[PDB]
A paper describes a structure:
One group of metal ion efflux transporters that regulates metal ion homeostasis and can be found in all domains of life is the Cation Diffusion Facilitator (CDF) protein family. One of the most highly conserved and abundant integral MM proteins is the CDF transporter [name]. [name] was recently proposed to function as a magnetosome-directed iron transporter required for iron biomineralization since its deletion abolished magnetite biomineralization and mutation of residues within the conserved TMD metal-binding site resulted in alterations of magnetite crystal size, morphology and even mineral phase. To summarize our results we present an alternative model for the CDF [name] mode of action, in which we propose that upon metal cation binding, the [name] induces conformational changes towards a tighter and more compact fold which allows the activation of iron transport through the TMD.
Numbering used by the authors:
A (entry chain A), B (entry chain A): 213 to 292
The structure:
Amino acid sequence: HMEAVQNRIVEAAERVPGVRGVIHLRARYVGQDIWADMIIGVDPENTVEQAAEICEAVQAAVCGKIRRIESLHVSAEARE
Amino acid sequence: HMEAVQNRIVEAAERVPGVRGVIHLRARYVGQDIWADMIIGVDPENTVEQAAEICEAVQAAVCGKIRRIESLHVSAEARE
């Protein structure tokens, strides 16, 4: 069920270089698939280009570890 | 009606230093009030802190020029 899977999403995101916590994570089942929407924190002094790069990195790492996720949006917000 | 008001939103955003076009703008009436959701473009080499600053700037400039707007979210995406 969901919570197990949410823990796995947060844990996978957090192991990616540049991720400063997961700020928000919304996940829902579309049948047997997961669709999710997430915000990560990032260094405020990172450039927008760097923030985008970490987001794709997170998107790839999470999709790679949790196979049932068929849609994942990752966006970023300054933190710390 | 709406389109007039959307033109005014885009025009106000675009006069703010650091705004590289309006990428997306969703506006709806909640009665006589406007609630809107917008994405601006920004220099990819700006820092996340700078991108946030321009967003607040846009939020303030648009709310100040279009009085019926009672809710406005501004977020940012690298452009050019």
